[PDB]
Design a protein around this ligand. Structure first.
Ligand SMILES: CO[C@H]1CCCC[C@@H](c2ccccc2)OC(=O)[C@@H](C)[C@@]2(O)O[C@H]([C@@H](C)[C@H](O)[C@H]2OC)[C@@H](C)/C=C/[C@H]1OC
Length: 496
């Protein structure tokens, strides 16, 4: 029944009839592949629901010579495209100044970067803002305040959120508005400038521990120390790899689970949690199997993790979608790990159990629309689809519940994407991107067992094909293990 569907004539009427302040009808996508297809597809569906016009919000995509040559699907999907230099991403998708120049010349009113590339570079929203261009993500001020790993951990401690023992343990900031910030003098105290103090901090932290360079990433500038004897060599190896960068130390995550809490915030300080996900099964800094919601931790503890994630977001003035990752231990304790100031490729797991269109939520949020005025958010909280009545996310009268269970798996064998459909289960969707390479499969079920079963069946179907006639066999064995099937806490060995 569609009789109660409310629609407007255009983006302008939507913004005015929904308490927004900025009209966005043209968006520049600084990304390709599945990210670009996903972004356009999600928002277009929303445009159909709100304007009965799938193309009400036009899209412009950045295209490299390579992508255009392989006639990537995302290109044809866009209303317009702008050819850009090829080569590494620093010459295109991750080039902050290039993205901005394009956004202004078209011009568009907003930019979406997705994940990867420049999506976590605070200078992007910073430069966009200075040019009157909205960003479908957190503001630079929100990333400057949350800062890196050092800053955010310090911030977490200030809000009294448990953290792992590190060279910054105990540091806190002094804490109406005005987001929290970390003084440079406080920050430096969390870094180690030399082997000598590095050895003193490592003694109290205890081994094994990680020596990390904040400016480092993607397996770069990281090193694991097992003893005070190897510390010096390792510490200096990090200096050599990423010279001139601040360095901190952190206790190594023993046998813990990794839980993430999905966050969504508006431009008025409101924020809500969209349950969370479990990404414990990893293979050397790589999410292999993910579940939603998370169920390994008791609901009351997990709700506490949600409360901490929201306080952390509000205090720094976060805006848009984001993820707070926690470490859950065998006992029952948890510690803040980090906060991903952007959407991740696995956000659909959350979209499915919360029936929330994340990309469309991002777009409306950047238009100035308050959380309580988002249809999906109102329904999640059991309110009227089009009501204007504010919602108490703290103590709601209609406890929001997650619908079903989701299992996502990374599969392995540019901008070209291949949609995978299975004759087995109509409740599974997938894709993969040729260089071949990787992709992801997503499975839904009324409960965890049916979600796992649907996944196993679709994966068995993939094995039949040539490309994945072996590489997906380890996932099927993993998914059908007793320990996984029984949803046990001790499954760190599934990593092998
Ligand atoms: C690249 O586009 C793919 C992406 C599929 C992603 C996985 C899939 C899924 C999740 C879990 C298990 C199985 C399948 O998620 C979904 O279908 C749901 C959650 C969702 O993403 O659908 C999209 C939006 C309405 C919205 O963003 C969200 O709805 C709330 C629509 C536009 C479908 C897009 C697809 O196009 C065919």
């Amino acid at each position: 029944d569609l009789h109660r569907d409310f629609t407007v004539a255009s983006p302008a009427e939507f913004v005015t009839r929904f308490g927004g302040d900025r009209v966005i009808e043209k968006v520049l996508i600084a990304n390709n592949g599945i990210a670009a297809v996903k972004c356009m597809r999600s928002i277009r569906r929303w445009a159909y629901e709100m304007f009965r016009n799938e193309r009400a919000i036009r899209f412009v995509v950045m295209v490299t010579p390579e992508d255009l040559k392989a006639n990537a699907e995302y290109i044809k999907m866009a209303d317009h495209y702008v050819p850009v230099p090829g080569g590494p991403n620093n010459n295109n998708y991750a080039n902050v100044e290039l993205i901005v120049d394009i956004a202004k010349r078209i011009p568009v009113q907003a930019v979406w970067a997705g994940w990867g590339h420049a999506s976590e570079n605070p200078k992007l929203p910073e430069l966009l803002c200075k040019n009157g261009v909205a960003f479908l993500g957190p503001p630079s001020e929100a990333m400057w305040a949350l800062g890196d790993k050092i800053a955010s951990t310090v911030v977490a401690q200030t809000l009294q959120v448990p953290t792992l023992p590190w060279s910054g343990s105990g540091l806190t900031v002094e804490w109406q508005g005005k987001r929290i910030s970390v003084p440079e003098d406080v920050y430096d105290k969390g870094c180690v400038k030399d082997v000598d103090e590095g050895l003193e901090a490592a003694e109290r932290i205890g081994f094994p521990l990680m020596i990390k360079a904040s400016e480092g990433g993607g397996g770069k500038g990281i090193r694991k120390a097992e003893s005070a004897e190897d510390f010096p060599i390792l510490f200096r190896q990090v200096q050599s790899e990423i010279p001139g960068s601040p360095i901190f130390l952190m206790k190594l995550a023993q046998h813990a689970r990794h839980l993430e809490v999905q966050i969504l915030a508006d431009q008025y300080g409101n924020a809500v949690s969209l349950f969370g996900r479990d990404c414990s099964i990893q293979r050397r800094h790589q999410k292999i199997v993910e579940e939603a919601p998370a169920t390994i931790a008791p609901l009351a503890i997990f709700e506490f993790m949600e409360q901490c994630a929201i306080r952390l977001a509000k205090t720094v003035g976060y805006v848009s979608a984001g993820t707070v990752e926690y470490l859950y231990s065998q006992d029952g304790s948890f510690h803040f790990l980090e906060l991903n100031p952007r959407l991740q490729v696995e956000h659909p797991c959350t979209e499915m159990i919360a029936d929330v269109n994340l990309p469309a939520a991002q777009l409306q949020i950047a238009m100035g629309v308050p959380l309580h005025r988002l249809k999906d958010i109102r329904l999640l909280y059991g309110e009227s689809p089009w009501g204007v009545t504010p919602i108490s996310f703290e103590t709601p009268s209609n406890p929001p519940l997650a619908r079903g269970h989701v299992i996502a798996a990374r599969i392995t064998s540019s901008g070209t994407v291949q949609e995978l459909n299975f004759r087995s289960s109509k409740n599974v969707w997938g894709y993969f991107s040729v260089a071949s390479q990787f992709g992801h499969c997503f499975s839904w079920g009324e409960n965890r067992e049916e979600a796992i079963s649907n996944m196993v069946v679709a994966l068995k179907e993939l094995s039949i094909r040539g490309d994945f006639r072996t590489t997906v066999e380890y996932l099927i064995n993993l998914l059908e293990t007793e320990s996984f099937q029984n949803n046990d806490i001790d499954t760190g060995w599934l990593d092998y």
